[PDB]
């Protein structure tokens with residue numbers, strides 16, 4: 001069956017720093033003119049990130065072909081929204097990618113490209129919050145409790161939580177959201193360069209951040225120690241990006257009742273090396289487990305034991321970095337529960353585009 | 361017509377983080393078979409960096425074909441040496457690139473691949489110093505003054521200068537070489553992640569680092585202020601990387617009389633926006649000129665005044681960064697002369713390979 005003959009469908013592509021994800025969503029619309037019954041009918045994920053590849057015709061064609069060709073329905077509107085991988089590039093370079101992408105869509109007749117563009121980290125943060133709250137079913141009715149969302153990406157990280165309008169804070173970090181007939185005010189922030197790829201490029205020669213005897217590029221050996229690695233990463237969070245000074249005073253005044261994390265942290269928390277129950281973690285436990293299971297283990301043995309985890313070599317660093325970000329940066333308690341969403345649910349920010357077509 | 365019929369020839373590829381450069385050099389050798397009379401007989405530069413492309417046989421074949429095919433001579437030894445762009449990747453990912461590259465070279469019968477590898481930052485630094493001193497004609501005789509070299513690349517930066525052999529400092533950052541009958545002892549260091557591209561990814565939403573009204577990725581506006589941007593970059597140099605604690609004590613004990621800078625800084629210093637005499641800058645003058653002529657300008661207007669410069673938008677950040685690195689990191693006096701080499705001279709570290717493989 002094609003659901004799109006009886007329900008509205010659109011395609012939304014998350015063109016993220018590490019890869020692109022096509023989603024086709026079916027949905028209906030209610031009397032407030034808001035989508036309801038949003039269902040993902042198709043997903044395809046490819047690597048590497050769109051902004052990583054040579055912006056020539058042959059390369060872009062192979063990539064877009066790989067992403068789209070085998071989709072079960074093509075005669076629908078397409079939203080191509082890139083995030084921090086593209087925001088790392090000069091605007092003149094991004095234009096080369098979008099001109100090639102526009103050309104590609106012009107050479108076929110089925111997909112109807114509505115928009116292709118780089119969205120800001122603040123737009124991405126809004127979509128992050130909408131996507132999680134749609135899955136929680138907390139959008140249709142006014143909530144008594146405060147839901148905070150973090151998106152732990154490769155090139156940027158987002159934090160977003162309810163906060164009344166504040167005249168002392170940049171208009172860019174505040175959004176007023178009207179959805180299902182309710183008004184929601186949110187604080188949004190994205191930290192470009194603090195996603196896990198970009199952050200890691202500052203610590204590749206830090207022995208404390210790699211498993212024992214991991215070969216660092218400078219010829220020294222890993223000698224993992226999560227608390228020590230964490231203190232190194234905290235200097236990038238706070239001395240450089242001032243995460244603490246920006247975020248902590250706001251969260252102190254606008255406490256969050258429930259935290260949800262999406263993005264790459266869900267793959268780490270779900271890996272064989274870790275144990276968490278109920279799809280939730282705490283920072284204390286994530287740092288301890290990373291320390292015990294990776295930082296203080298022998299690299300060759302670990303590499304041979306988990307030959308499928310192409311991210312394994314960074315697990316000591318990532319466990320340390322997530323703690324630095326959430327605890328030292330955002331000021332979240334080490335023993336505070338953080339919910340994460342199984343990666344197999346495909347929950348990125350793209351549901352937020354279905355719900356909310358404007359950009360700020 | 362045929363420069364390799366009467367001279368030895370070698371190809372050296374700098375597979376750098378932002379692009380690859382094929383050099384073919386002709387040379388003679390002296391009584392010890394050390395190269396002399398090194399002349400660049402071919403240069404070709406392509407983008408992007410090898411370590412950024414998809415590591416499959418079709419992509420790699422196109423990239424190597426673009427880099428190599430039109431070279432005027434092919435039946436010579438080739439070194440393919442990658443630097444910090446490849447160092448950013450774990451060995452498992454690098455292996456995919458070198459296995460494909462090894463296959464591509466086995467498939468043809470003109471080029472004579474000697475080595476394709478990621479060189480260490482310390483070897484890169486050693487080649488940086490040899491290349492510059494070869495061109496200054498300072499290697500033939502024992503210098504009564506210290507020449508220091510900085511290579512300001514895209515993913516790492518190197519610093520290298522004379523330091524007598526000692527038991528105070530780790531053997532890891534000390535190199536000894538014998539060339540043209542003299543013994544030379546150097547301190548070498550490379551800082552991965554502090555090259556310009558990697559550093560810049562931490563400051564793209566910093567208004568102080570861009571011209572007024574430049575559109576930052578987050579939607580805010582540039583509001584350039586080089587001293588402010590410089591203090592931001594300094595926090596990365598010293599609070600995170602501890603450049604100052606690693607380098608300053610050693611330069612205090614081993615002062616450098618003349619500094620030479622290579623890598624991407626030469627393009628910045630050579631641009632139309634800056635006025636330096638005698639192909640030398642000072643850090644204070646670089647910061648002041650970037651502050652006045654880019655940071656404090658209205659971006660749309662400045663971009664229209666200099667419309668053929670795709671790199672201009674980053675000059676407020678880069679002038680701030682270089683001051684942060686050299687002055688706040690290395691401890692160089694802000695008024696000390698730093699020589700730069702005109703970019704048309706194609707002076708990267710590759711002449712160091714020609715020299716060192718014969719030692």
Ligand SMILES: O=c1ccn([C@@H]2O[C@H](COP(=O)(O)OP(=O)(O)NP(=O)(O)O)[C@@H](O)[C@H]2O)c(=O)[nH]1
Nearest residue numbers: 016017018083084153154155156263264267311
């Ligand atoms: O199978 C996987 C796939 C990804 N990962 C991790 O997820 C990270 C990518 O997280 P993500 O997909 O949320 O980031 P992204 O590509 O959307 N990046 P951004 O949102 O554009 O910044 C990787 O860097 C790696 O750490 C795994 O551990 N295992």
Ligand SMILES: O=c1ccn([C@@H]2O[C@H](COP(=O)(O)OP(=O)(O)NP(=O)(O)O)[C@@H](O)[C@H]2O)c(=O)[nH]1
Nearest residue numbers: 376377378379443444513514515516623624627
């Ligand atoms: O024509 C050019 C080419 C490059 N550039 C600048 O030089 C920078 C690259 O400097 P480089 O060649 O020394 O770096 P690299 O590729 O060798 N990097 P690494 O040495 O591998 O770390 C670019 O990022 C760009 O800012 C120009 O300004 N003009």
Ligand SMILES: [Cl-]
Nearest residue numbers: 217218481552
């Ligand atoms: Cl290194």
Ligand SMILES: [Cl-]
Nearest residue numbers: 053054413414
């Ligand atoms: Cl590519």
Ligand SMILES: [Cl-]
Nearest residue numbers: 120121577578
């Ligand atoms: Cl942003």
Ligand SMILES: [Mg+2]
Nearest residue numbers: 016017083153
């Ligand atoms: Mg993402």
Ligand SMILES: [Mg+2]
Nearest residue numbers: 376443513623
């Ligand atoms: Mg270089």
